[model samples]
Target chain A: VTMLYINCKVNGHPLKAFVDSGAQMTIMSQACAERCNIMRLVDRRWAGVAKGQRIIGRVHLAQIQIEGDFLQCSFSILEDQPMDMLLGLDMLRRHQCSIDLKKNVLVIGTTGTQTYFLPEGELP
Target chain B: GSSTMLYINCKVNGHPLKAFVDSGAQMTIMSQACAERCNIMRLVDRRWAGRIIGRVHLAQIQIEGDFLQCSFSILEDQPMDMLLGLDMLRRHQCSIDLKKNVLVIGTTGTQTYFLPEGELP
Candidate 1:
């Protein structure tokens, strides 16, 4: 499958981002957030209510800049998350983003104008 | 921006079903309620939920004429009818078009589109 992965700067630090439509909203790991230290608040919600319940913690507002553009939104903070950020469908649709699988490009904006690509074909 | 829920018309063991596609999920799940309706056999317990709440099995699901042999986890208490998770998406290289309300093989060329039931909305 053509998994869409992107590289972006979150609070000025290079971070890994993924476009996961099923996620329904944006989520970030605390590891990256600490480096940037952009912590603001704690709705601390994890859209993970469907995971059937857990002690999963805090939601915080973060400054996420991608492709020279910034996405300032509330990010769910978790420890040891797979990626630095999982850019869920909410942000994806809001930006009108789509993926070109074969090309490995993430086309952004309602116009399909802005674009971003990952540093490599394989994601960790 | 996107639908609160998306369903795709497909077949489980040749019988028609509505499958929920979730890219964020690691497990491909089938509902216990639809277990008898979908009619696949019982397999084994999975360590996914850290308990016996998850069952692993193989299912023949036909989507757009391709009967795919999928590794599925049967969850006793699920919120949806059936779920197609990241494993299934990876196996089929599927891509979602939420606005168009369809899921497909994700090729730029001709695709075997699976759309939402009824008015394609």
Candidate 2:
């Protein structure tokens, strides 16, 4: 299936993102954690995967800057590239996003509507 | 964090079941335990696909009363009895409303809302 991708940063370093509201928590691939120098504060372990694998060893707390808001976030490190960064249900609800699939934009929060989108001529 | 999780309410063959909508999930998950009691006879599909996550069973699910049919990956110990993931959402063109606690499935406007006990479904 095709996914919505976003350009964002982790501690000011470039990162690719996929919005997965089906996911219960935000996740970073192990490769991403290494590149951004994010460290695990504690082990958040053993959770179910939708496709039928169990996730082991997850971590929390990485400074993320998305649409100009800097926030400390928790991340479950996945084994492969489902995407570089997976933004899950936690972030989606917190921001109360109005995702326009047709318009190709994700307008988040009630006030600023902090925007994330595809380029003028691109499709996610 | 678990306190705020979104749980969806849907039915299979008119029998009720609580479901969670997970857009990240590759498959629509179901509980064989509930399916049996609800009179949903599982259909066979030997094609076995990716995320194949073992075998899956196809069934007719009616969400908030709007009918649709699909396959479900059987889970033995899932916390919720059912899941309606991305494929289901997109195919149905579902819309979510946090302010109203409503999820409208398809352009047809068939939907389910989160409500107080003994109230609307």
Candidate 3:
């Protein structure tokens, strides 16, 4: 699969991520969360629907980064998901983005744009 | 506290389509009708994948704008044309700039604009 390297700061901490537009939100892996000392929200709630099955859990997170943009956001923790974390629409709506699919490139910024490139390949 | 309108173009089989970016979704998903229009089918059966919910198979998708490539699950119960879910969102490091009505997607750092709630054309 084509993967791009993106530099960002989470809560002022620098980090990187692979851009996947098909994703609905921004994610922080469990490992990353632990490293960053991210904590679960005190108020936990059941969230999300999968195959008519609703999963309930507490949302937790510390902070995240995309480029220089930083957000102290909360996430719904799912014990069963394999990924460390996932970025979703709740986060994507925060900035302006330009996607170059032909070139496998994405540009994000508030006013100006910065470009990130992905390795050429088919989806894995 | 500012709010921006966010939207993801929904398409089936590489066709221009409409969809909502739903943060509430645990997985990348699409409507059965939309999947049918795209001539796509599920790749996996319903099984427990994450959290406390059961996972299901979905067709692979190539999102426009960012041209994000991803495998989505088919959900007959979904209320939107397509929903960008947490699974895909995390891979891209998604974010929202509500004040600008833009959606920042992935390491590519691409942004998509949206119409305000009452401003849909």
Best by lDDT: 2
Residues B1-121, candidate 3: write the lDDT tens digits: 1102346554555766566654445566666666666666444345643421233343434454456656666666556656766566656766644445555675677766654566431
Using DockQ as the measure, the top candidate is: 2
TM-score of each: 0.64, 0.65, 0.43
Interface RMSD of each: 5.7, 4.8, 9.4
lDDT, candidate 2, at A124:
31
Count of clashes in candidate 3: 51
Model 3 regions lying over 4 Å from their true place? A1-5, A9-24, A40-63, A67-74, A102-104, A111-115, A118-124, B1-121
Give the Cα error of residue B79 in candidate 1, in Å: 3.4
Worst 10 residues of 1 chain B by lDDT: B107-116
Candidate 3 chain A, poorest ten consecutive residues by summed lDDT: A50-59
Q: What is the lDDT of residue A78 in candidate 1?
A: 60
lDDT head-to-head 1 vs 3, winner? 1
Candidate 3, residue B68: the lDDT equals 66
Question: What is candidate 1's local distance difference test score?
Answer: 0.61
Instruction: Tell me the tens digit of each residue's lDDT in model 3 across A1-124.
Output: 2344455565455545544444544545545544455444423344554431333343445455554545456555443444445555454444545443333444454544554552444211
Worst 10 residues of 2 chain B by lDDT: B44-53
Which parts of model 1 are misplaced by more than 4 Å? A1-5, A29-31, A40-63, A67-83, A99-105, A109-124, B1-3, B42-58, B64-66, B99-101, B107-121
Candidate 3 whole-model C-alpha lDDT, 0 to 1: 0.51
Tens digits of per-residue lDDT for model 2, B2-92:
2155566777777888777665665677766665657653442435533332345556777765777666766556666777776666566
lDDT tens readout by residue for model 1, A1-124: 3355787887578877877767765767666567667454434443344242321444544556767777655556666665677888666656655544444456564444445555445565
